[PDB]
């Protein structure tokens, strides 16, 4: 033995204890996982060493409005498209399912108005009375102006750019955490007054349930406010009613395709709404996991976190559930720490959701941050979030590779992978942002074993009951191996 | 007592654990020192409050071109510039002082020549025997272009602004990687012509040792390739004329200024050269280590790490001082996984530099996505040298908050703050990067504590010996105590 084969030794050793601690590197692979795993590390190869070696742009580190063509050409992604990402366990229901099937199906249906406004963005409402009663815009049918376009696709392409965020590169057109904010809670009121509306609403849902299906997602957790629903008379539903109505869409769509695991509820609040609007809140969430314990998980509380009221505001509401005689165990699912900064009231958050035993936390970006948080969150078994392409688009990195999960990924913490709002800035449900994990997310030397690890996590840090979990595992299993085979014998010689 | 009351001593407990545990969190300040952390602190938050509620741009993590101006009207970056911050551990010769003095002084001498080239950038060279034997450019004697401006400042001025990396926004200009190192390898091919003329080096490397100490440093560590310094007959010297050229110059201003510390030299190779001509480098620097054992610290390699060679390539040459008999243990320096990329040749030299026993690495922007790596280091005491606004003009990193040794600092990793060529663009010796690191790399409870520490690491992790980093501690401390002692003096009521 050299001195240099000593040396050599010592540093497989080393190499090979560092690596061996990042998520899925206990993943197991059969010979044909292993031939798709082979597959899909060619390609990422050549990328990595074409970027590096020939000193080009890495596309798939780039902004997703430049880099989402490109994505769309490459054999991997088909390879991700096709694979089972078990589930999608971050959503909001408003921003889940295209914008082309609320152009297409939604704006088609009677008494439907839009405008122009203030700002220079289309609105959409539905008024069964009459004209909407803000007289503030210039309400128009939209029938009547897309009968007066003379051009139906044109103006089916011009609505859904005036409402989508990835008409335009939105790190050019919105360079800044404030104006990319400002164009995000546009888009969110330019939908407001027609999502709302009872039978869109469903029909909507049901949209959700059969994009993420169609893109290979068994189950969905959807964030969701729930009540608000309205009819052509006026009449507003309260969350029981959205509950109810959600629940009997995915029981029929449960029915239909058994291949199916399902989905639940999680309420949603509004980060800067005053404190007893968010404690009604607490005592409903409560009400509707008394009543529909298999169906309601939980409580969030959600919108822009650095601008808006810290957890610590509301602790009064959120500890309420907790000071009864019996106390009560209401699930939390916080949004928490989506900011750069370190030290002040919006990273403090986590310090408040794992005092209040959350379930899960959305994003967590400035986790890494804080040695202790994260040292707690593990022991907890409270597991991470992650939307990349949300974390891009929303201001809080530019290289995807400068993710701030990256280490924690690189040491086996427990994590989620979803699209935050995949219809606002037009990604598939699940397939983009999982494409995106595994070409910045983890490195040169890693492709099947994490995509898989996160497929089982997205099962292991449910919401759902462990019969539940072990039922979806079967499910999943079932589809795993059918995608596995079909695969590899389209790759594979004969 | 109460369920709100508990969980707000329980809230206090665990945000004092996560925030013990901080670089500098042991440190304890005096009232004088508590006066001026209240000081720097006030400045902090206004800034961050301000961002953070008022939804504006954080000035201090923008680019440095856009944020200089800024830094340079704020009252906290005074306090900066008074404040003895030790050594500058991490230099490169050739960039290390201001082009100023090379406009102003260098490019007055007679036999300097300057010229245009095909990329329409001004190379200066110096030619004794006549005008330049490189036909492909066509050389002026500075001297006379420099008479036929008209406006002797505007001439000057325009020299420089051909020359530095801050006349334009970087992060605009050369929006990529390969576009800033080509320019960066551009502004040094610049130089390379006129700042190897041994008058002028000389010259040059003094001016070095009166701005660190003007910006209130008190001991450096310059990288040097040390050899080729040419006289006005063609006469090259080697690298031990360039080391007692040094050794001399710093031994004056030593014997000039008392209050100083000292200077000491680590020979830098490029990372693109033969393996063969690694290997002469190497036995230079042992040569060097065993005549000059307190000036002459080790051996490095620099230049850009992504397309170029690694340190496995070059393990033959970097592995002969220690298959010696008996070993000899040559210390080394090395730059690390100044990279984005995981997994990859360019970060897994991280692995064989600690496996070559590195006194300290360069950079290390990837050691935190390696938790093995991260582990052995700390273990070892191997510091870490940062150079904030460095990361960010080479393209690393875009917001300076999402740098990726935040976290680590938030675990008290050994690490110190340097300024990697601080004459490239324009920079302050180390009161820019100091400010950068308080600004950006630590939260919004952290001001002085946090200097005092990376002060005080700078000679903690110097390569001084123990005796000397004795002397050196009782100097920096005179100095501190007069720092402290005169700002409150100007800054409290009488
Ligand atoms: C988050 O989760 C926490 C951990 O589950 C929750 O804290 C738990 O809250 C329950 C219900 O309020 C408490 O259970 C009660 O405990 C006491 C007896 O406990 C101790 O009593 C003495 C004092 O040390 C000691 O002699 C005993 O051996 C016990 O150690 C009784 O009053 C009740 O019968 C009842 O069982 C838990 O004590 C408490 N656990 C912890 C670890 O604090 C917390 O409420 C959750 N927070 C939120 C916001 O949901
Ligand atoms: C980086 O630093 C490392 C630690 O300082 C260096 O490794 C050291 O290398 C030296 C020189 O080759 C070794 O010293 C020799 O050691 C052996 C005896 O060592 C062991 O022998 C048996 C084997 O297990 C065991 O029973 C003994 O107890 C000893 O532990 C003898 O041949 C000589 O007397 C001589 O002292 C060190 O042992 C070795 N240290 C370690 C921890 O491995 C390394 O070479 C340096 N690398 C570079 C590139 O500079
Ligand atoms: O109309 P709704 O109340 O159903 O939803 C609309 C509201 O959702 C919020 N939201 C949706 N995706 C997210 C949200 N907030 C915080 N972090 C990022 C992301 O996770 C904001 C919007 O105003
Ligand atoms: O040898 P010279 O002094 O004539 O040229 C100086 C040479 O140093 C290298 N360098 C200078 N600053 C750095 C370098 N390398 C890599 N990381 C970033 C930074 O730390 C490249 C240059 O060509
Ligand atoms: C770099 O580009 C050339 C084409 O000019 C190609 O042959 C080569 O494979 C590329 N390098 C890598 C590592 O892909
Ligand atoms: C929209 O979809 C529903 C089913 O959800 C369908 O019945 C209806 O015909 C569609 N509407 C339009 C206008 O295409
Ligand atoms: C929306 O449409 C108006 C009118 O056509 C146009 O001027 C404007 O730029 C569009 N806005 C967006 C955000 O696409
Ligand atoms: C926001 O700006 C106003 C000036 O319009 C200033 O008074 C206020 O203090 C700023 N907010 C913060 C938190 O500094
Ligand atoms: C150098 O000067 C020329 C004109 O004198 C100008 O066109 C060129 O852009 C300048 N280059 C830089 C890098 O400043
Ligand atoms: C340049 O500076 C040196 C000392 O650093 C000094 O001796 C010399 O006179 C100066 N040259 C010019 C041309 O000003
Ligand atoms: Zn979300
Ligand atoms: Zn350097």
Not at 29 to 45: G, H, M, P, Y
Not at 176 to 193: A, I, T
Not at 201 to 228: A, C, K, M, T
Request: charged share 25%; glycine share 4%; aromatic share 12%.
């Amino acid at each position: 033995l050299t001195s240099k084969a000593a040396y050599l030794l010592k540093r497989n050793s080393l190499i090979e204890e560092d690596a061996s601690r990042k998520l899925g590197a206990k993943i197991v692979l059969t010979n044909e996982e292993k031939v798709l795993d082979d597959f899909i590390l060619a390609e990422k190869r050549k990328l990595i060493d074409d970027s590096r070696l020939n000193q080009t742009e890495y596309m798939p580190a780039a902004s997703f409005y430049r880099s989402k063509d490109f994505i769309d050409t490459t054999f991997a992604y088909k390879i991700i498209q096709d694979m089972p990402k078990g589930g999608a366990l971050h959503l909001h229901d408003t921003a889940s399912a295209r914008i082309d099937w609320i152009v297409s199906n939604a704006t088609y249906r009677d008494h439907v108005y839009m405008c122009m406004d203030q700002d220079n963005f289309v609105r959409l409402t539905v008024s069964g009375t009459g004209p909407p009663a803000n007289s503030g815009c210039e309400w128009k049918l939209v029938e009547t102006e897309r009968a007066n376009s003379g051009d139906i696709a044109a103006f089916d392409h011009w609505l859904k750019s005036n409402i989508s965020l990835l008409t335009t590169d939105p790190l050019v057109t919105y360079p800044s955490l404030d104006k990319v904010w400002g164009r995000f809670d546009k888009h969110f009121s330019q939908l407001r007054g027609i999502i709302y509306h009872t039978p869109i609403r469903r029909d909507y849902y049901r949209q959700i349930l059969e994009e993420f299906r169609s893109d290979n997602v068994q189950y969905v957790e959807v964030r969701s406010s729930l009540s608000g629903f309205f009819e052509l008379d006026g009449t507003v539903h309260d969350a029981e009613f959205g509950l109810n109505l959600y629940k009997s869409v995915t029981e029929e769509f449960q029915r239909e395709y058994p291949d199916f695991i399902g989905a639940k509820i999680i309420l949603s609040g509004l980060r800067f709404k005053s404190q007893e609007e968010i404690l009604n809140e607490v005592k409903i969430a409560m009400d509707l996991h008394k009543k529909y314990p298999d169906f309601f998980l939980g409580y969030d509380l959600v919108g822009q976190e650095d601008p808006n009221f810290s957890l610590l505001h509301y602790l009064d509401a959120l500890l309420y559930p907790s000071i009864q005689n019996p106390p009560y165990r209401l699930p939390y699912f916080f949004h928490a720490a989506e900011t750069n900064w370190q030290e002040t009231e919006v990273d403090y958050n986590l310090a408040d959701a794992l005092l209040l035993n959350t379930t899960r936390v959305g994003h967590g970006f400035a986790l890494i941050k804080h040695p202790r948080f994260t040292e707690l969150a593990k022991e907890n078994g409270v597991a991470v979030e992650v939307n990349p392409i949300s974390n891009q688009i929303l201001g809080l990195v530019r290289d995807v590779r400068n993710h701030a999960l990256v280490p924690l990924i690189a040491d086996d913490y427990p994590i989620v992978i979803s699209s935050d709002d995949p219809g606002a800035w037009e990604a598939s449900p699940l397939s983009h942002d999982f494409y995106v994990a595994l070409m910045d997310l983890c490195g040169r030397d890693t492709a099947l074993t994490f995509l898989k690890q996160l497929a089982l996590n997205s099962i292991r840090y449910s919401a759902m009951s462990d019969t539940e979990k072990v039922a979806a595992k079967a499910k999943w299993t079932t589809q795993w191996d059918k995608f596995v085979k079909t695969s590899v014998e389209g790759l594979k010689p004969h």
